[PDB]
Amino acid sequence: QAFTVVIPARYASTRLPGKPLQDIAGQPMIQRVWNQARKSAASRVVVATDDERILAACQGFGAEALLTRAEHNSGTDRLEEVASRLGLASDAIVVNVQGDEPLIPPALIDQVAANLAAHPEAAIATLAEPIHEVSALFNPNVVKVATDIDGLALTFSRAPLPWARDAFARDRDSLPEGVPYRRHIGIYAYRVGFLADFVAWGPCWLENAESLEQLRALWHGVRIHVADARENMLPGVDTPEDLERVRRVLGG
Amino acid sequence: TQAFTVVIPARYKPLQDIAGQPMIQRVWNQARKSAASRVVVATDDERILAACQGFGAEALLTRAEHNSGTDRLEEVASRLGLASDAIVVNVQGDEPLIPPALIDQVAANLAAHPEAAIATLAEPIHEVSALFNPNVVKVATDIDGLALTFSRAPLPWARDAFARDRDSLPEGVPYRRHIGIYAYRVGFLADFVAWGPCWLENAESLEQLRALWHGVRIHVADARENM
Numbered sequence: 001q002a003f004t005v006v007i008p009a010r011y012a013s014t015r016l017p018g019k020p021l022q023d024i025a026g027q028p029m030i031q032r033v034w035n036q037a038r039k040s041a042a043s044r045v046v047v048a049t050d051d052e053r054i055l056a057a058c059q060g061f062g063a064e065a066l067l068t069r070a071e072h073n074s075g076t077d078r079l080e081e082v083a084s085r086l087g088l089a090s091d092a093i094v095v096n097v098q099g100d101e102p103l104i105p106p107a108l109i110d111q112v113a114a115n116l117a118a119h120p121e122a123a124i125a126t127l128a129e130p131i132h133e134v135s136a137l138f139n140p141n142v143v144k145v146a147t148d149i150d151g152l153a154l155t156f157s158r159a160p161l162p163w164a165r166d167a168f169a170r171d172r173d174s175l176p177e178g179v180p181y182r183r184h185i186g187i188y189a190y191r192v193g194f195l196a197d198f199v200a201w202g203p204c205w206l207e208n209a210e211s212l213e214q215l216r217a218l219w220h221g222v223r224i225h226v227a228d229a230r231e232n233m234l235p236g237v238d239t240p241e242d243l244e245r246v247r248r249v250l251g252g
Numbered sequence: 253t254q255a256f257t258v259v260i261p262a263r264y265k266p267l268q269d270i271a272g273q274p275m276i277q278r279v280w281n282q283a284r285k286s287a288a289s290r291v292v293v294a295t296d297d298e299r300i301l302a303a304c305q306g307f308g309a310e311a312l313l314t315r316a317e318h319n320s321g322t323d324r325l326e327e328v329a330s331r332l333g334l335a336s337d338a339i340v341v342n343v344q345g346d347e348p349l350i351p352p353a354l355i356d357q358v359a360a361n362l363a364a365h366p367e368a369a370i371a372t373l374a375e376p377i378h379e380v381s382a383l384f385n386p387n388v389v390k391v392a393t394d395i396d397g398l399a400l401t402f403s404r405a406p407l408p409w410a411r412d413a414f415a416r417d418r419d420s421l422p423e424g425v426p427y428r429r430h431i432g433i434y435a436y437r438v439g440f441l442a443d444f445v446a447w448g449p450c451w452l453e454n455a456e457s458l459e460q461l462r463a464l465w466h467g468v469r470i471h472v473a474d475a476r477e478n479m
C-alpha cells in the first residue's frame with residue numbers, strides 16, 4: 001500500500017528557538033525525523049516547513065522540502081496545504097510525522113498507514129499506548145482515548161476516561177487493576193479527501209473546548225481507527241532537556 | 253404513533269423512602285400516565301415485588317443472576333410474549349422526575365432513527381458540581397445526535413476554562429446529563445444480553461457502554477420538557 005509522509009517543521013517555539021535545527025549528535029532534529037521516516041515503507045517523504053532556513057537545511061542534507069503558510073491554525077490544516085500542492089488523489093493516504101519526534105519508530109508509521117487501509121469505514125487511523133501512572137490519567141495534558149471492540153474511537157478527552165467508579169471512589173492513588181487505560185499517540189494516517197472535509201467544516205465547539213482537532217472528525221460523524229502502538233513511542237522534544245535526553249539515546 | 257411497553261427495572265434504594273410513596277411508585281405513577289400500552293416492574297427481590305403489588309403495580313420477579321437492568325428487562329419482554337420488533341421503554345427506577353411526555357418522546361425517537369439501536373435522552377447541566385460528580389452521568393454526542401460516549405467523568409473537558417478555575421462552569425459549552433431512560437426493540441434486547449458484560453461497562457458501571465463497545469449507535473435527544 002502506497003502512502004506519503006509529511007513532516008511538519010515549524011521554526012518558532014517558546015522554549016526552543018529554531019527548534020527543528022537544534023543539534024542532535026551531529027544532525028539537526030529535523031534530519032533525525034526524516035531519517036526515521038525514510039526507514040518506513042513510505043513511497044515519498046516531504047518536509048513541510050514555515051521558514052526558509054529550515055527549507056535550506058533540509059535540501060542541504062537531501063530531503064525533499066517545501067515552504068508552507070506560517071499561519072495554519074492546526075496540524076491538519078498544514079497537511080491539507082501540502083496534499084493539495086502535491087496533487088495527491090482523494091483516496092491516497094498521508095501520514096503526519098511531527099518534526100519534533102526524532103525517536104519515532106518506523107514501524108509505527110507503517111502501522112497507521114496499514115491500519116487505515118484495512119479500515120475503509122474510517123477516514124483516519126491513529127495509535128495509543130497503555131497508561132501506567134494514575135497521575136497521568138488525571139493530567140489534562142495527557143490525552144485519553146477509548147475505543148469500541150473494533151478499535152473505532154468512542155472519543156478522545158483530557159478527562160480521566162473511562163471513569164473507574166468503584167475504584168476511584170475507594171482510592172485515587174492507584175491505577176484500577178485490569179482496566180486498559182490508553183493514552184493517544186498523535187501519529188495519524190489520513191485519507192486525503194478527509195483533509196478537504198476538515199478544512200470546509202472549520203472548528204467546532206467540542207474541538208475548541210478540549211483543544212483537540214481530532215474531535216472535529218468525531219463531531220461530524222467521521223470514524224477514527226485506533227490501535228495499540230506496535231512498539232514503544234519515546235517522548236518527543238519541546239525543551240533543551242528533551243534534546244539532552246534524545247542525544248543520550250543516540251550516543252551524543 | 254407506534255405502541256410500546258414500559259418496563260421499570262428495580263434492584264434491591266427503590267424502597268423507598270420519600271415523600272410518602274416509594275421512589276419506584278413515583279416512577280410507576282409517571283409511567284402509567286404515559287402512552288405506554290402496559291407498565292411492568294422488573295425486580296429480583298421479593299420484598300420489592302411485594303411492595304409494588306402492594307400499591308397496585310404489575311410486577312414480575314426475574315432471575316437473580318442478571319447483571320444489568322437491560323438484562324432483567326429482556327427476561328420480562330420474553331415473558332410478556334412481545335414481538336421481536338416491539339418497542340420497549342426502560343424507565344429506570346431512579347428517575348422519579350421523568351414526566352410522561354419524555355417517555356412518549358424516547359419511544360417516538362427510536363422509530364425516527366433507524367440508524368440507532370437505542371434511543372435515549374439528555375438534559376442540560378447548569379451546575380459545575382454536577383460535572384465533577386460521578387453520580388451524574390455525562391453524555392457527549394456528535395452533530396447528528398449519536399452518542400460519542402457516556403461517562404461519570406467531567407466530559408467534555410474544557411481545557412482553558414478548567415486550567416483557570418475548576419470551580420465554575422465553563423461558558424459556551426453545552427454540558428449534558430444522561431437521563432436514565434432507553435427505548436429499544438425486543439429483538440435488540442436479545443442481542444444485548446447475548447453480548448454479555450464488557451470491561452468498559454463494568455468500569456464505569458454504565459450498562460449502555462456495552463452497546464457502544466459492540467459498535468451499535470445510540471441516539472441522544474434533548475428532553476422536550478424540563479424534569
Ligand code: NA
Pocket residue numbers: 306307308
Ligand atoms: Na396500597
